[PDB]
Structures are given as C-alpha cells and as structure tokens.
Amino acid sequence: LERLVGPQDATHCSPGLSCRLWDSDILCLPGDIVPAPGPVLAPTHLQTELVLRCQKETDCDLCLRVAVHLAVHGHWEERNASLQAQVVLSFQAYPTARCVLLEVQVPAALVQFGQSVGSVVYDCFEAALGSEVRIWSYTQPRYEKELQHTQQLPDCRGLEVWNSIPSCWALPWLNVSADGDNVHLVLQVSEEQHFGLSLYWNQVQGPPKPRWHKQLTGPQIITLQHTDLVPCLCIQVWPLEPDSVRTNICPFREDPRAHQNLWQAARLRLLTLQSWLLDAPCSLPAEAALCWRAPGGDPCQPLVPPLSWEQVTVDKVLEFPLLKGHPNLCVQVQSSEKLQLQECLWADSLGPLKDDVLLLETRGPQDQRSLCALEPSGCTSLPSKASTRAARLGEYLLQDLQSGQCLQLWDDDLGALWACPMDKYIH
Amino acid sequence: LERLVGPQDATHCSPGLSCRLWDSDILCLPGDIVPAPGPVLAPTHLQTELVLRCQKETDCDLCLRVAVHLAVHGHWEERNASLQAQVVLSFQAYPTARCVLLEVQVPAALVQFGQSVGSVVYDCFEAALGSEVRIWSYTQPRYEKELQHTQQLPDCRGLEVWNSIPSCWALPWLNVSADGDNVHLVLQVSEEQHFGLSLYWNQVQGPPKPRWHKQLTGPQIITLQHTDLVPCLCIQVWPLEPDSVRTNICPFREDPRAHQNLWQAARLRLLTLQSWLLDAPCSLPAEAALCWRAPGGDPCQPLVPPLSWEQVTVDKVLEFPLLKGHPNLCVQVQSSEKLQLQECLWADSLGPLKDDVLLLETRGPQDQRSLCALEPSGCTSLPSKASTRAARLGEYLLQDLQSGQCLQLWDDDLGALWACPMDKYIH
Amino acid sequence: SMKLDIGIINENQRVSMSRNIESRSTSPWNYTVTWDPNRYPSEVVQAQCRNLGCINAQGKEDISMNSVPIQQETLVVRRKHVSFQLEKVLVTVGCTCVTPVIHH
Amino acid sequence: SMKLDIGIINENQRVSMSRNIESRSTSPWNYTVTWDPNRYPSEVVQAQCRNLGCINAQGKEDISMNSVPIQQETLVVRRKHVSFQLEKVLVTVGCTCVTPVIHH
Q1: Is D96 an interface residue toward C (CB < 8 Å)?
Q2: Which residues are registered as beta bridge partners of A110?
C-alpha cells in the first residue's frame, strides 16, 4: 500500500492468489513462444508506482513497485483446477540490470478463461534519480509477447524526494552573512566532505573571470571583505567526485554595496588615439560620451550636442568619433542616468590640461558658420558683449580660427569642434 | 619453423612428445595451487615469435607464436611411466582475450625428474599492429605460479610488415604531378574507399589555416593551379572510419614556384599609426625597415641608418618606431636578403606622396646638429655647393628647420628625422 | 562440461550515478538495443558515436579531434536445443574524444 | 540448475583496431588489473579517470569539464567448492569528457 517500503524485498498478491518471490537475481530467458497446452496465466499489463525504500530515516532511495496483471489465456480445455505460473520481471536501468522470478498459484475459483485472476506486486527495483528504467514481464514458458514498460524517474526537484533522500540534502549548503562587518560564506557540509569551491565574475560573452579556486575538506567559513563584492560575483560548489552536480548562486545581483564597488574598480584605458576600452568586473548597461575639462578642475561639460551618448559594453573596444585627440577631452560614463566615470584618456599621452577654449561652430542654411565658445557658464555665441573670458577675446579668437591658429577636433556636414589656445592672451 | 603460418591453428611438439590442440576458446581457470601427487609436468618459460598468418597474399596479419617449455616437477616417487599434462595458454590483447587448451603426452623415456621434456608451440594468437599483448601459461590442475609474458607489437614501420599487411598498404596513397601545366594530387585508393581530404597552410603558432575539406569516394585526381602553391601547403588524408590514421605530407617546402607565389599573396596592413601587420600564407624569416619614397616613383631608399632592419613574424602586430606618420614613408620587407614587399601604408590615410625633402640630423659631440638631405643620389650634407635640388635650397631648408616649418618624424639622443615641404619652392 | 547456477552473484555496487552522459559528452553517442530471447542478457545495448569528430565549445563538429568508441568483450549466456553456452559479444559502451594519430 | 559448456562462442569481430586511446583521450584514464584464479576471466581490467577535469589544447587540466567513467555491468564465471556461478562485476571501461550538470 504505502509510499514507504522496508529494506527487504517482498511480493504482494491480489485476493485469493499466492505469490512467492524467488529472486536472488536469476538467469531469466524469455526464450521462444510455445503453443499453450491448455489454460495458461498471462501477464496482461505492467503498472509501476514510485516508492521510497528506507534502510534508516537518513538513507532513502527511489524504488520502483511493479504490479503485473494476470489473466487466464492459452487453449481452452473443459486440489483440482488450480493454475500455476512463474512470472519473470526484468529490470534494466542503464548501466545495471536485475531479474526477479515470482511464482503465482491461482486457486480454481479464480480460473475463468479469458478473464483476470488479479495481480502480483513487487517491492521494488531501486533506481537512481533522473534515470530512465525499462521493465519486461513474461512467463517461463513464454506463451505470448513480453510486456514492456519505460519510466523516466524524477530529479531532486520533487516534494517527498527532497527531505528524505541524501543525494538531495547531502549537497553543499551555502548561506551568506554580511552582518559581521565583513562577508561570510557559511558552507554547511559533513566533517568528512571534500569539495571544489570557485568564486567567479559572471561576464556575458565568454563568462570565465577567475578569482578563486579551492579544493577543501569542509565545513568551512570563507570570509571576504565588503570591498570584494560585485553584482556578477557567483559561487560554484561541488563534491570532489566525478560528474558531481555543481551548485551556482549569484547573491549580489541587486546588492547596493556591490554596484558601489563595481564602479570603484571600473577603469577606462587607451589602446590608441581612436581606440578605448571599458574595464569593469561586471557588465552593466551604460552610455558614454566625450567631455570637455577645464584647467580650473573637475567641472567637465559633456559635448551633447553635437556628439551623442552611445551605449558602452564592458571589455569591448570603442572607436572614438573625433579626428584629433586633446588632453582636455575626457570620457564620461553614465549608468542608470548617474555619472560613474570621468577618465581624461589623453592626459598622460598629450597632457597636461592645456588652457584652450573650445569653439562649437554650426553651419546654418546657406552654409553660415556660427561660432560658440564652451565656457563654465554654458556656450557663449561669438563675438559677444559678455563679461566672460572668451567673449572679451571673441574677436581675437574669431581671427585665430579663420587664420587657422585653432586645432579642428571634429568635422561634420552640420558643424565642427575647435580647440583654440588662450596661452597667447592669458599670459 | 616459418615466419608464415596458414589460416588454421596448429600445435607443434619438440621430439618425442605428442601435443593435441583442444582450443575452441575454452573456459580456463588457473584455480588454486594443489600439492603434486607425484611427478607433474610444469611450464618453465614462455617464448613468443612474431609470425604472419595469411589467408591469401593480400590479407595478412601479425600473429603470435608461443612456445611453452615443460620440465618434470612435482613430488618424486620411484605403456608405463608416460606423463600427461594439459597446458592452458591465455592471451589478452586489450580489449579481446582468448584461451587455448593444449594436451601434452610425454613418453617415459623423456621423464627425468627436474629436467625438461621440451616444448609445445602454438600457431598463433592474432593481434593488431602496435598492440600490447599479455600471455599466461599454466597446467590444469595448477601445481605452480602462472607464467606471464608481455609483448609490445610493431607498427607498420617494420620491413616484412609493410608489403604483405593491408593495414599498411590500404592507406591513402598520394602522388604529385606538376608537369600537366597545373598541379595534380593523384590519390591511389580502392574504388570503394570513402576518405577525408584536407588542404591546409601549416602556420607556426596556431597552425590551422583552412583552405579545403572534402569527404570523397576515391580514387580521385584533385587539380590545383600553380598559382595556389605555397611552401606550407600540406595535405591530410584519412579513411572515414573512427580513429583512422591521418597521413600528412608537405611537398612544397623548397619548391621555387611556391616561394614565388607566397610573396605575391603577402600584404602589409595598417591597424593604426603605430600598428602594422604582415599577412602571408606561410611564415618565413624576414627583416623589415622604414623606407623613404620619392614622388618621382618607385626608387625607395631605406633609412638604415638611423633605423635598423628588424625581424618580422607573419600574423604578429608590429609597433612602428617613429613619432609621426608620413605618406612618403613605406615599409620594406626582405627575406634571404632579397626585397619582397614595399607597401606605402600611409598613402590612403595621409596621402598622396608629398613633395617633401627628408633631413637626417645627427647630433655630434658637444651636441653639434649636423643636417643631411636624403636625395636620389645619396645623402647630401647641408648647406652644400652640389647641383642637386636640396643642396640649392640648403640655406632655405636650414631656415625652415630651425624656424620649425619642418615636421619631426623621429627623435633620439643620437639624431632626428625631419620632413621638410618643398612645395613653397618647387611651384 | 559442468553445472551452472540460475542465481547470479550481484555485488550491488553503486558507482552508477552519472546521468545523460551520452548527450553531455564532447564525443556524444546514441544507443541501439539488440534483442535475442535465447541469450542472457536478452537485451545487449550498443553505443554508436554520433560523429567522427568531437563537439567544440560552440556546439559544432571539430574534424581535428576524433570520437572513438570504447569497446569491451563481454560474456552472454546462450541457450542451446537443452544446455548453456558462453558467448563473447563485442560491446561499444560509449565514446571518448582523442587527438588523432597523425603520421607524417 | 543446468549444464554449461567449456567452449566459448567467439564471433571474432574486429572493430578493435583503435590504439593507446587511454592516453590520447581528453579524459585520459589508467588501467588496473584485478586477479582471481577462480573467476573467468581471471583478469578483469578496471579503468580509472586520471583527472576530475578534462585536458585542454595546451595539455593542462580544465575544471570546467568533467572526465567521467563509462561503466558496464558484466558477467564473470565463478568456480564453487564443484559447480559454476555467474557473477555480475561493474567495470569502468574508459572515460569520456562531459559538460557538467550546473544546477542554479
């Protein structure tokens, strides 16, 4: 009846019949079919119920209960009319296989030609989680075609299947504690457990970003600094056994501190004038654009327009839009519409910050050249009557520009960017 | 006696004794050792001779002849004194195994306690080329320890082993004919043969350079153009069977036409100002250096000195030495001290050829600046009384240089290279 | 010829835990059930390498490597007439990925 | 219990041509000879995977892949007292390289 059988094998009969289990894993041969010499018992249909064979409460496994239905077949000929039958049960769960012989005695009262006698039940063929098992049934002599039955077995993903089976709980348990001012990896395994532990940074394309690997003998508590936290920091655990199941967990995906540290570790690097790279532990969606830094310090004004915020992908080469590099040109990086990076990539190569004014010419209709100077207090159209450095020098800068004393940084059908040195006027 | 046995198994005796081969691959058990009940025959030493079992002249295989030596052992007790013995021969060539029972009758005249009776010989255990085979011998009953013998078998690399064994000649035969104005790959295989064919360019580090792959049904004649020939062009043939042996051949390694075509297909490419790449089908040792091309045409003078011929490796990034690029600067490539390439890498990017004079200043002791102009007729020291373009303009160029009207291409503690535009004087 | 028992000694070993190995392998294989009712075991499962080459990281066939079958010589019991006879059957169990024997 | 013949039916198959597979494999293995003189075959050769991971193109161990043993349940004949009994032995034949079961 029960979903729980003991550790010993046992047979079960429908009322009236008598079944004796004769298995010690016999040498079962279906053999050839023989003409029946009168009424024979015949296996009609196999039915398999999944069951749990427990040798103790901790040690439990999936077991397969098989019920074999029998009917009176063979030739019709008009203790006396009792019918004997010896029923083989063949089980094949690749790689292993086992054979079970059962013997049924059906009393005369149950012997009605054509109709059933009932069933014989077998507890049970033990098989591995997720295995595909095949069963065959037949009598010996064989009077008909063998019955066949194929079952796919459940994975640890089943209810009962979890708490009682060790192949489901004896897995490397992981818990996290960010309360001890540091980050703790609580590894709940048995004292005797040998296991592989790997801390990795889960990147999009070509995910391996190795950080740590340790063959251990648990249980252990691996302590990390809250400065080592990144959103793509994932843990991989597995017992050091061939084909053991690996458990992966990414618990920092939306952690505030992780994202905080992610940008602290992010760096912009120059490969060549027209090649730059974003280096970050994790790959978050971001937008990047060129910025103009003044020699007065950090107040860096982005050049949108005429330029645009383009999507930046971590560990992918970014080809600069402009024709000429400038020490005052910095690359700005924003994610979730918040500024995260501002590396002035031409400060070491072409540096330091030059005292140059940036002019934004815009060709109007009739190809009219309209000049504007990028100043701390916005863009001022030249020449102007403003009490600002570039407006005061407007007429001199306009002469510099058209006399070709200014460096062209960017050219387009709609406009141009110009770097005009002020050094001749400020000193 | 012979190195050639027939296809049927047969036993051989030393004089006097009688041996009957009883093998049909028996169920041989060494079993446990038993006390001898008087004189017993004992296997003393195994000896294996390699032999050739031929069912026809084409079908032949390596066979293992085993001679088992027997002596009178056991207990000493003082047709009559004839001794019987049944000798097992166990052969194990992984994965297969076979057992041979032989029965020896030793006449009384040969029964001398302690001494030999002679040998029984077995033709033969067939085994695969290059296989490691293990042999055991013992009597049944077993009165002593089994004898053991391990043999390593030869590969097709043996004499007799070649011409008579099919696993050696049934290989995909390849011949080459460059006489039919084109190049021919004569593939001598049987009409029924299915085989993999691959034409590749054998590179040093990371050798795959795919060119062709064809699953065929030979014999075939693959025709190539003598324009497709390169020294590293190698052919790979193998029958389409799991783990079949692949045959590789590189017949163009020192062919004149191949080397000729190699450079025709070689190209220099620009990645950025300070990055260039040599693209060639094969990787030959070569030296590369910067060249100065005049607007008059092809007569390109290399700049050694102050520069040097540096070793160039095919499919490896080469970082330019100079600080500024020039359309007149070309890259020259030499191999076996012969010029093979002259690509002017800045002709499309910064081109066309500018009418500029190249000045080679050399700082002497006391840091003395000595200027020289690279002209078609060598380098002329400035200012000069020569009837050459740059000498005539010497005094004007010297003014241009020191007035900073010349572009510096290269700087060093020992000298500098200068590009001086002549456009102001030639028109 | 001697007598043989119907009982089969089973050591009940458990190293059999690995799952869907035939599909997860870089040298994947397919199975084929062979059936004979006068043979013990009646079903002898034979593996066949799915490809000649091995499967690369991109999930495509790689000609530079070879899927090779792993064979084992095994015993089956055959019924005769009635008597029993042992019979050796060569079984491909699975496949492995090997670097080819490239003779020059 | 029935009678069994001493003769062994041998089909003489030849698919056995592959060489040094245990060392040429990306999931290499070592062999171990087990011996019992009252067992047929007396020597039962057992393979053991040389590593937990597979060997990469550079000849080094790769943790991201698994060398997994290929096992086959096989019959051996055992001598008793005298009578014969069949016995099932679990044999590791070789190893294959598999992509691991990474549960999340």
Answers
A1: yes
A2: none
Q: Determine the residue type at B271.
A: L
Cα(C33)–Cα(A154) distance, rounded to whole angstroms?
24
Give the domain range for residue D54. 19-100
- Note whether B112 and B187 are same-domain residues: no
Closest CB from A95, A213, A240 relative to D73: A95
Determine the Cα–Cα distance for residues A152 and A132; give it in Å rounded to an integer.
Answer: 4
Helix (H, G, I), strand (E, B), or coil: what is residue A259?
A: helix
Does an H or E element contain B408, and which?
A: strand B407-411
With beta carbons less than 8 A apart as the criterion, state whether A130 and A18 touch: no
Indicate the residue type of A266. A
Q: What is the CATH number of the domain that holds C93?
A: 2.10.90.10
Mutate to test the interface with D, among A91, A246, A248 (most CBs of D within 10 A): A246
Sequential DSSP letters for A97-112:
EEEEEEEEEE-GGG--
Domain span including residue B284: 266-343
Residue B271 main-chain phi, psi, to 5 deg: -100, -45
Residues B95 and B76 reside in one and the same domain: yes
Q: Are B201 and B264 in contact (CB under 8 A)?
A: no
B396 three-state secondary structure: helix
- The torsion region of residue D72 among left (phi > 0), alpha (psi -120 to 50) and beta comes to beta
| Same-domain status, B36 and B126 | yes
Structural domains of chain A, count: 4
| Together in a domain, B185 and B241 | yes
Those residues of chain A whose CB sits closer than 8 Å to some CB in chain D are 25, 27, 95-97, 196, 198, 208, 213, 236, 238, 240, 242-243, 245-249
Give φ, ψ of C70 to 5 degrees. -100, 115
Q: Are strands D39-40 and D43-49 parallel, antiparallel or unpaired?
A: unpaired
Beta strands at A39-54 and A4-5: parallel, antiparallel or unpaired: parallel
| HSE (side-chain half, CA atoms, 13 Å) at B143 | 20
The verdict on B73 and B178 lying in the same domain is: no
